[model samples]
Target: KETAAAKFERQHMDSSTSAASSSNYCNQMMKSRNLTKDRCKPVNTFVHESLADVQAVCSQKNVACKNGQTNCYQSYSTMSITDCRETGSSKYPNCAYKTTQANKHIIVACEGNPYVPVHFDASV
Candidate 1:
């Protein structure tokens, strides 16, 4: 058995990556909306606004952040994307899960040596 002192040790412990393309591509994508990640590179998520929606937004960003109100911080933690195959059974039913856009993990870089994953896993 473990000691009570260990269990009551005055604390519960613990605490806390964008997979987008490299700096150059991202910069161009953001500024000119004119770039694409090397498909040969095959990133899970591109580093820049190479996608249609992103390209549109980056170029048409007319609104400005006022009083530092419109900024986003990559959580000082992990960026992960995870997935699993279907299992279980019929009647009761095996997953019935959609096989479209829900099967992957996208790890991101944070301000740390051993970067953590920003998970986008199924919550079941």
Candidate 2:
């Protein structure tokens, strides 16, 4: 069984590739990671930082999540990230994406005894 923390890492972490290869980066990555399988993930973000750095955000300032959950925390320092938005023409099983990169403070929801990130809430 896959844990939420592991799933989050699969969907959002890309520490090795600091920058997008091209506009096609999201298209390729989304497909490769199985995010565009049965249906496309409408929107997603990838963090270009070490796993430890991202996990540290769990210990940062607490904040309310989009759904009003208080488990979310915002990073103290801005981090490099990429937003992948499904294109207007994109459809199921053939998802298309637009890659937009930026530097922003990340917000994530943590869980479990060790309290690691389980969800990528947003980037501010």
The models' CA-based lDDT, in order, is 0.22, 0.93
Q: Which candidate is the best by lDDT?
A: 2
lDDT tens digits, residue span 15-64, model 2: 99887778999999899888987899999999999999999999999999
lDDT of 1 by residue, 7-118 (tens): 2111110111233223333232222221122221111222211222221222232222323432212322222221212223212211221111221322221122222222
**Predicted structure 2, TM vs. truth:** 0.96
Q: Which number leads on TM-score?
A: 2
> Candidate 2: where is the Cα deviation over 4 Å?
none
Clashes (N, CA, C under 3 Å) per candidate: 17, 0
Q: Show where candidate 1 strays beyond 4 Å.
A: 1-93, 101-113, 121-124
Question: Lowest lDDT 10-mer window, candidate 1?
Answer: 8-17
